[PDB]
Structure formats: structure tokens, C-alpha cells
């Protein structure tokens, strides 16, 4: 996937958007844009509202001005995005016809949603017990284990959805860069992995501090708190609220506290193992390809739909992979999650990745493993034998907040 990030950064045409005028700059030194067309396009949260095509007449080291037609603008909420692509209409000796040589995208506008949902017809029922809290509404049921504080299971009808409880995740199966030159023999104490290892990240144990159910006028409200600790040190603290409403939608709200003195975590989010296994994945965010925070300029915001298989990157030396950032909506089977997050999804647990030396030895697991991150640390790469993640990409704030909406179709 890195290859794209290169391709885009090294592109020979450069853009600037000023109002509804696009300024094109050519980085060619000798040739004129003579097999180049510019395709443009506007879309609202994945929905296309407009397209153009314009032939480029820019000389090497030159500029070309492009004024766009009056752009539609809807009442509907959502983000409006402009996306442009340069195309090579004719084939060359090293390119096919219709090859895309460059691209760029901008966000044009946002119509924020000032609309409150339709007051639930129904109302969820909470059934208590000493083991757990159950929420029922319709065919749907959710169970939270009062001993662990996690949502242990959920049913749609008679079918269970989880194989594993939904839980907080602060680690990642180490990339090559996280490891560096650290070996079992000769440990590199500076390598991210080592730091994380040493600090207990990988083996910290949760601790129920609190777990309560409350009945709201039109919803149920669960509230929890855990502490992750290692050797009497509290590394992190997770505070959530789940709120299920008549719509049969759960809203998760999470708030982490990270100890100042612990290596910054690779990530901060949740994961769980789904029972289902679907053929496609559809999301509205950056893609289509694997993208990380310090590696996402080549990616575009849009609605992508791909086969599960494509959500895994077969790096010969298995590690965390396949992430997609800036996701606003993700759809898998009957599930739909909404918010602002980064995520990844495959048939391999982090642990399996982390414990397999070669990709050929991985085996697909029972269902689908889903990792949804409110936040993810960068991947680095300046070199692979010392920490290369720039500070801007390290999860060093201390306080982290995020929210989700899980639901069905």
C-alpha cells in the first residue's frame, strides 16, 4: 500500500483551490500537459452531485486556471467534497489509456445536522440479575456482564453476534518499525515494542471500578469504569456509557485517561470478535487502501466497498495492518457503526498476528475480528532501527474522548 502514498506525493501536477477556481501547477520541466485530462467531481457524503472534465494546457513549470461551474449545494446535511484526478487519455509506452497520474481532494462545505431523532415508538426493558444486565427491545437483546463490565453478548433474534466481548484495546501487533533491531537475545530497550512490553501494556489486567444500569425516560443507560494496571500501576482508565434507546441503537461514549509516565499507547479503541463473516465491507471514510495517520495523504474520502479479503495486507512478516482512517460509517453484515474513527477488520486477532513469523502460517479465526479505534499512533519509517514516529503522531495527550453508534439494518 505504501506505493500509493509515494505515487501521490511524487505526482507532477499540483493543485490549489481558491473559491471555485483550481490552480494547476506543472512540475514537468520539459513537457507540456499533452495527454492529460482533468476529471472533477463533487459529492456529498459519497453521493455524487457533479462532474466535469477538462483538458490541461499547462506548460512545464506552468500554471493553469480552472474555474468551475456553479456548484450545486444541497440543504441536506453532510460534507461536501471536491475531488480531482488527472488522466492520461492516451496510452504511452509505459502507461495504458486512462491511467491516472495525479489527484487531490478538498472539503468544500459542511452542513451540520440539527435534527433530533423521532421519539422512540417503544422502550427498552432492563432485566437485572446478579450476573448481568439485559436489555431487550424487539428481537434484539444486549447483555452486559456485571462482573467484567463488558458487553458480553448480543442477539438479533435467536442469533448471538459476538464470540468475544467488546473490550478496550490499547495495543497493537508490532510493526517492523515498532520492533526495530530488537531481538530476543539482544533487546533494544528503545524500540517501541520493548517500551510497551516493559511497561505491561500487553499484559495489563482490567479492573471493574463501576458498572451500573439506570432507567431513563426513553432509554437505558449503562455506565462502567475500568482501570488497567500492571504491578500496582494504573496505566489507563476507561470510562464509558452505553445508551440504548427506543430506536434500538446503542451509543457508546468513551473517555480514556493515560498515565503521563507510561509509554504512549499504540492505540486507543475497542475490539471484539464478531460471530458473522460477510463477503464485503463498506465504509464511508478514507480509502480505498490501508491508511495510517502519518500515511494517509494519498487516500480519499468516500464510500468504499470491498471484499473482506481486501481489508487485510499480507505483509510477509505479520503485524497490525489494514487500518483505514477517518471513517464515519462502517457496514458489515447487519452492523453499522457510526462516528469518527479509524478501524480494521479481518479474520486474525492481533495476538495471532503478533505470534506468527510468517504470513503463510496464519489461519483464519472463527468469525470476524473488529478493531475500532478512536485513536491510533503513526507508523513511522524514517528508518527501521530507531524510533521514527514523529511526535505529532504519538498518543501523548493523556485525555482521550470518543463516541460510537452501533446499530443494525
Amino acid at each position, epitope marked *: 500500500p505504501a506505493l500509493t502514498e509515494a505515487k501521490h506525493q511524487q505526482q507532477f501536477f499540483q493543485f490549489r483551490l481558491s473559491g471555485q477556481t483550481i490552480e494547476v501547477t506543472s512540475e514537468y520541466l520539459f513537457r507540456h500537459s499533452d495527454n492529460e485530462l482533468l476529471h472533477w467531481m463533487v459529492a456529498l457524503d459519497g453521493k455524487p452531485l457533479a462532474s466535469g472534465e477538462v483538458p490541461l494546457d499547462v506548460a512545464p513549470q506552468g500554471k493553469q486556471l480552472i474555474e468551475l461551474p456553479e456548484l450545486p449545494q444541497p440543504e441536506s446535511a453532510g460534507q461536501l467534497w471536491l475531488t480531482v484526478r488527472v488522466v492520461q487519455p492516451n496510452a504511452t*509506452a509505459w502507461s*495504458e489509456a486512462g491511467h491516472i497520474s495525479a489527484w487531490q481532494q478538498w472539503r468544500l462545505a459542511e452542513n451540520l445536522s440539527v435534527t433530533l431523532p423521532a421519539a422512540s415508538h417503544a422502550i427498552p426493558h432492563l432485566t437485572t440479575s446478579e450476573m448481568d444486565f439485559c436489555i431487550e427491545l424487539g428481537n434484539k437483546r444486549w447483555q452486559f456482564n456485571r462482573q467484567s463490565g463488558f458487553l458480553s453478548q448480543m442477539w438479533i433474534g435467536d442469533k448471538k453476534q459476538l464470540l468475544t466481548p467488546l473490550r478496550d484495546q490499547f495495543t497493537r501487533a508490532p510493526l517492523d518499525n515498532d520492533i526495530g533491531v530488537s531481538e530476543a537475545t539482544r533487546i533494544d530497550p528503545n524500540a517501541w515494542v520493548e517500551r510497551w512490553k516493559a511497561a505491561g501494556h500487553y499484559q495489563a489486567e482490567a479492573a471493574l471500578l463501576q458498572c451500573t444500569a439506570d432507567t431513563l425516560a426513553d432509554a437505558v443507560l449503562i455506565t462502567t469504569a475500568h482501570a488497567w494496571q500492571h504491578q500496582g500501576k494504573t496505566l489507563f482508565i476507561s470510562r464509558k456509557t452505553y445508551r440504548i434507546d427506543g430506536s434500538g441503537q446503542m451509543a457508546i461514549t468513551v473517555d480514556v485517561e493515560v498515565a503521563s509516565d507510561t509509554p504512549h499507547p499504540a492505540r486507543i479503541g475497542l475490539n471484539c470478535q464478531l460471530a458473522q463473516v460477510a463477503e464485503r465491507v463498506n465504509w464511508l471514510g478514507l480509502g480505498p487502501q490501508e491508511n495510517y495517520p502519518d500515511r494517509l495523504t494519498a487516500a480519499c474520502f468516500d464510500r468504499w466497498d470491498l471484499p473482506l479479503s481486501d481489508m487485510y495486507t*499480507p505483509y510477509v512478516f505479520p503485524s497490525e495492518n489494514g487500518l483505514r482512517c477517518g471513517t464515519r460509517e462502517l457496514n458489515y453484515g447487519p452492523h453499522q457503526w457510526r462516528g469518527d474513527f479509524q478501524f480494521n477488520i479481518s479474520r486474525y486477532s492481533q495476538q495471532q498476528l503478533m505470534e506468527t513469523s510468517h504470513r503463510h502460517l496464519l489461519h483464519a479465526e472463527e468469525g470476524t475480528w473488529l478493531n475500532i479505534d478512536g485513536f491510533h499512533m503513526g507508523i513511522g519509517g524514517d528508518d527501521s532501527w530507531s524510533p521514527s514516529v514523529s511526535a505529532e503522531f504519538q498518543l501523548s495527550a493523556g485525555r482521550y474522548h470518543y463516541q460510537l453508534v452501533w446499530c443494525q439494518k
Partner: antibody
Amino acid sequence: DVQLQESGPSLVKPSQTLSLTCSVTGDSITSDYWSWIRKFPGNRLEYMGYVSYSGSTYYNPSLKSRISITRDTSKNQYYLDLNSVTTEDTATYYCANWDGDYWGQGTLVTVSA
Amino acid sequence: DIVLTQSPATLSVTPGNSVSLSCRASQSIGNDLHWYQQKSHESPRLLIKYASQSISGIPSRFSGSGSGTDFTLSINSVETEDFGMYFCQQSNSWPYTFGGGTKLEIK
């Protein structure tokens, strides 16, 4: 030295899946790229596809996603699966390495009701 | 996709004489053009690769030439064992494609 040989049904029914095996002897299947080529009754040759060392596959668009090429290192064989065949798929099928130096003897497969 | 056109479709020659077969691509394919011989009830046999590169085990009388869109396979002093079909194939772009073939027969 290397030897390739096709095996599998010579007669199949319309709509079924045509499956052929190419047995490689003399060297490992992990030591080359493997292909499938077929010749239609009218002397027309078509390159169906190939699988390279990483496992990446390349299929002829003419096959409209009906083709799958897989490998089995333990048996030192690779395969061709062509789904929903029609009379248009009647042809002589050959397996050969990507370089084109090694070819199987070819096997005629007739698709008839 | 790249279309390869071969001419003539059929060529008759008397053993001892020389012939040249043509293969033209719909678009430039550099030097990625290979030549195959095929006889009835037999698998294709690679004669020349990458337009003009020789193949071990092939008679010296076979030679190839060309680049871009126009290629030629020449047979210096045809032998009876040379009668059969000749196909060109390009590997410059996927999908690889074959020409329609030229039949070489005894005159």
C-alpha cells in the same frame, strides 16, 4: 528435468465447474510462475491466466470472473477452476510455466449437454 | 486489449526456400513479442522470445526481428519439420494475447 501434465475430466455439462490439475515433477511449484492456456476448435489461442510466486493471480478479463487458479505445494500441483461453463468453453487446455519453456501435453475438454 | 494481427494467414513454400511471417500489434509493445510453433495434436513450442532472442534447442534457421508494432519471424531454408502453425504472443500488457496464426504448408 521438469515435466508438466494436465489431468481431469474430458467431458463436462453446461453450467458446471470445469476443474483441471497440472502436476509438476522435477522441481518445486514455488520455483516458477504458472499458467493456463487454451486453444479453441478454430485454432484460436487464449491466455487464461497465471499465478506468480507471491500468490497474486492474473486472469483474462474474457473469463468474466469465472476463473480461479490455485496451488498446492505439498502435492506440487496447481489448478484451474472454470465455473458456469458453456459450449464456448470447449477447447484444448494446456498448463505451462510463465517462461513458456515447459508445457503439458494438453487435454481436450468438451462441454456438451 | 492488445490485438495481434498475423499475415499472411497461410503461406505455401517448397523445402529449401526461405520465408518470413508477419505479426503487428494494435499498439506499441516494445520488444515483448514471442513466437510459437504448434503442430496438430501438440502443445505450442517457444521459438523466439522478446522479438529476437534465441532459445536453446531451437534450430538456428529461426530468427526474429522487430520492435514497437511490427515484428517478423524468419525461417532460413524451410525444412519439412517446419510445416505447421505459427503464433505470436505479446506480454507487454495484461491480458497476454496471441495473434490469429499463420499456417506454413508445403508448396
